[PDB]
């Protein structure tokens, strides 16, 4: 299991390998490089934050197929569950959920969301301005919940 | 005998004030000897114990506070809340008037608590103060 094998450097070449095997485009690849550069100064355990951030970026760089085809959602966690040599899905869903919370407010995330025009403004205008009708993140959003529901269903049935 | 030897004319209190208030007060005491010439040295991010205290200025108190609060906290609603609490308790009074203090005109703040209650607040909050005073 590589994930449990913490305390390892993922250099510019190594991190660009980790983000090139999955073929991530220019802007997101260079942002991965820069954010690992930053996260090295502020890491606690590297592999967790690394896998979380990369999965959370990949899951929105290609929403035009993930939302379109629920199977590639399982395909990514399967190909990295093996690439990271993980134990099961549970640990990877911990990773994604927590890190996504830890990267949901970073400006780079807003920039990735706004730039590609794929799909945020509606949430910022109800969190900053403070409406009583924003979602309290105790539930899961109907879009990610649709993803989960459909993926686990087509995988089970 | 058990009376002939003490006046008992008094009719160090564990002041009701809270953690944020404890730190506010214990930091607002730090420039009863530490002029702004030294604070940015002994507190950076990298005897006048006897004499009457010199005058603070706001946003210096906030500075030393954010310094010695145990990045953890940046909210300042409870902070200023307890600051006004203090000023109502006349523990850190203003040399200037009683109404315009809460603007930012020329206005100085100074502690009105002696050093023993400072020892008390420090030990109770477990933060140590013997460091910042050096002579």
């Amino acid at each position: 299991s590589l994930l449990v094998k913490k305390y390892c450097k993922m250099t510019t070449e190594e991190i660009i390998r980790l983000c090139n095997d999955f073929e991530l485009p220019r802007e997101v690849a260079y942002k991965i490089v820069d954010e690992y550069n930053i996260n090295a100064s502020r890491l606690v355990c590297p592999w967790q934050l690394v896998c979380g951030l990369v999965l959370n970026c990949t899951f929105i760089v290609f929403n035009e197929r993930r939302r379109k085809d629920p199977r590639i959602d399982h395909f990514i966690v399967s190909k990295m569950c093996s690439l990271m040599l993980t134990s099961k899905v549970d640990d990877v869903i911990e990773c994604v959920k927590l890190v996504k919370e830890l990267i949901i407010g970073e400006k780079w995330f807003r920039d990735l969301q706004i730039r590609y025009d794929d799909f945020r403004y509606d949430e910022i205008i109800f969190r900053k301005l403070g409406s009583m009708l924003q979602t309290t993140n105790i539930l899961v959003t109907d879009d990610q919940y649709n993803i989960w529901k459909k993926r686990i269903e087509m995988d089970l049935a | 005998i058990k009376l002939f030897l003490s006046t008992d004319d008094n009719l160090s209190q564990t002041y009701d004030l809270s953690i944020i208030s404890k730190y506010l007060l214990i930091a607002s005491y730090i420039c009863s000897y530490l002029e702004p010439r030294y604070d940015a040295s002994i507190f950076s991010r990298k005897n006048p114990r006897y004499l009457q205290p010199s005058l603070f200025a706001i946003e210096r108190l906030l500075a030393i506070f954010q310094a010695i609060f145990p990045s953890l906290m940046k909210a300042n609603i409870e902070v200023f809340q307890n600051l006004s609490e203090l000023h109502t308790l006349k523990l850190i009074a203003t040399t200037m008037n009683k109404n315009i203090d809460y603007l930012s005109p020329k206005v100085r703040w100074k502690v009105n608590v002696p050093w023993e209650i400072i020892k008390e607040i420090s030990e109770s909050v477990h933060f140590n103060i013997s460091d910042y005073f050096s002579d």
């Binding site: 993140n137 919940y145 | 160090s12 009701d16 300042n76 109502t88």
Partner: protein
């Protein structure tokens, strides 16, 4: 136009009904305990005010109010054949000795008139009083907020009053509303006058926060007001505990405030409030059926089904494939009574009268309960060892509660009740894009003046020059866009003639600067150090 005048006035739902019928029960129990404590305070003060027949009868009896809010109203005995006149002095009413005396005399004379239906505002009014009003006098002084009054003045005033004890047809009593720290008072007065007050004193306390006999009690009443009808996660409880601990004097008022605000948030966004009572099971909609899918309990229990029930057929059939069966599967666990509240009340009243424990908090007790560390809670006193198995309660992991509860995961209330007042401003000023979406060109290629000036602001030292910053901002100023934008309005004549001025760039630079530094003084960031000089200034705020 006229707006520059001073304050010229201008003379121009089932969920909600449940909010009413429940919020009002909440406030009803609130106000019940409120009047309880109020009558308690009035009763204790009226009691202690009398019956203390001190044979000396040459020194007014003193009543200290430890931790007094200073807002506690006072009542008196009617006590016919003797006026009972209350006198209240504020630290504003006390510029000196003479005016304190005169204001007090006028007040008590007006009161003697109202009770009575040419007089010197002085001590003579005391001894003439009988002759001028018949009944003997008994006044009581209520120094509203003592800590701020200049104690030399108050001392002189008390020594003055001492002379009134040579008439014997009057008696006086003092009511000190100390904010706190009786030691603070006995630090300032002349010891010889303390020895005059110390004749018969009573260190009666007035504090809403004392052993939580009202705090824990109102917390429990709230628990009752919310019993079996919702839930509250450990996050909510710990947040309440934290924000309470930093607000010493008035915990209760703020506690009610935050609870009510959470309830309002719920009943204004939560759609399942109508589903704490079965009488609205017919209030269900297909879209409500959809939204009851995204529950975290929903997905967790789907996973538990897939794991435990190896045959996927039952789970698949009970899934979206059925809607009436699915909603029955949901309402199946809707009636989890959650003994957590019941056993909470149990252990509460138990250690209140069985163990009879007082210096404790039911709030953190309920926190431990939802955690299960209630053992490492009750251990604190070493008296439930024999009971930690009869007061035993392992926390139960109720299900489907993720729809009937309240937790601050979005920080809506926290950000709206306890905002980072300076941090929020610094953020929204420097960033400004998350809020701000012919002339759009400059807005898209040049920040709003406020933030693009704030950012130069940031690199400034303690003392800064006006004009150095002016030039460093001129650098930021695009003259090409300034001529793009000024002549972009041809419709105006005078603005066009302005637009052809050859030195217009630095002129408009000074214009925009002297509007910005203008509007950034009432906002508190910058200080115009030494008005009449304004050659340099200081940057008050720093990011930190």
């Amino acid at each position: 136009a006229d707006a520059q005048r001073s304050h010229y006035t201008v003379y121009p739902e089932k969920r909600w009904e449940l909010y009413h019928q429940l919020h009002s029960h909440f406030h009803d129990q609130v106000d019940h305990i409120i009047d309880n404590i109020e009558a308690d305070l009035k009763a204790e003060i009226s009691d202690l005010l009398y019956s203390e027949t001190t044979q000396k009868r040459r020194c007014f009896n003193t009543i200290f109010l430890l931790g007094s809010d200073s807002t506690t109203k006072i009542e008196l005995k009617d006590e016919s054949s003797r006026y009972n006149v209350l006198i209240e002095l504020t630290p504003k009413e006390s510029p000196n000795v003479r005016m304190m005396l005169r204001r007090s005399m006028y007040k008590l004379y007006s009161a003697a008139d109202a009770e009575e239906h040419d007089v010197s505002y002085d001590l003579s009014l005391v001894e003439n009083f009988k002759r001028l009003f018949g009944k003997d006098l008994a006044m009581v002084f209520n120094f509203k907020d003592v800590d701020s009054i200049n104690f030399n003045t108050l001392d002189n005033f008390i020594i003055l009053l001492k002379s009134a004890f040579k008439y014997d047809h009057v008696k006086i009593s003092l009511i000190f509303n100390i904010n706190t720290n009786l030691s603070n008072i006995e630090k300032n007065l002349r010891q010889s006058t303390i020895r005059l007050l110390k004749r018969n004193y009573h260190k009666l306390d007035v504090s809403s926060n004392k052993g939580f006999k009202y705090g824990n009690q109102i917390f429990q009443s709230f628990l009752d007001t919310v019993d079996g009808k919702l839930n509250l996660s450990d996050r909510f409880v710990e947040f309440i505990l934290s924000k309470m601990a930093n607000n010493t004097n008035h915990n209760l008022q703020l506690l009610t405030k935050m609870l009510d605000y959470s309830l309002m948030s719920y009943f204004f966004q939560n759609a399942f409030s109508v589903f704490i009572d079965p009488v609205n099971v017919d209030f269900l909609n297909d879209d409500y059926l959809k939204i009851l899918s995204r529950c975290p309990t929903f997905m967790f229990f789907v996973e538990g089904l897939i794991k435990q029930h190896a045959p996927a057929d039952e789970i698949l059939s009970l899934l979206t494939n059925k809607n009436r069966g699915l909603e029955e599967f949901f309402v199946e666990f809707l009636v989890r009574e959650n003994p957590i509240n019941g056993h909470a009340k149990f252990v509460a009243r138990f250690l209140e009268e069985e163990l009879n424990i007082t210096n404790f908090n039911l709030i953190e007790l309920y926190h431990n309960l939802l955690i299960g560390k209630l053992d490492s809670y009750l251990d604190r006193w070493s008296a439930c060892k024999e009971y930690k198995d009869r007061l035993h309660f392992e926390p139960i992991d109720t299900i489907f509660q993720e729809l009937f509860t309240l937790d601050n995961r979005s920080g809506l209330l926290t950000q709206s009740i306890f905002p980072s007042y300076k941090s929020n401003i610094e953020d929204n000023l420097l960033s400004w894009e998350q809020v701000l979406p012919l002339s759009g060109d400059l807005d898209k290629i040049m920040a709003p003046v406020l933030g693009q000036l704030f950012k130069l602001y940031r690199e400034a030292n303690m003392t800064i020059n006006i004009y150095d910053f002016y030039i460093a901002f001129r650098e930021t100023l695009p003259k090409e866009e300034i001529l793009n934008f000024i002549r972009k309005d041809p419709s105006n004549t005078k603005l066009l003639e302005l637009a052809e001025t050859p030195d217009a760039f630095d002129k408009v630079a000074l214009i925009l600067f002297m509007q910005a530094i203008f509007a950034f003084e009432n906002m508190g960031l910058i200080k115009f150090q030494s008005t009449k000089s304004y050659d340099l200034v200081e940057k008050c705020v720093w990011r930190g």
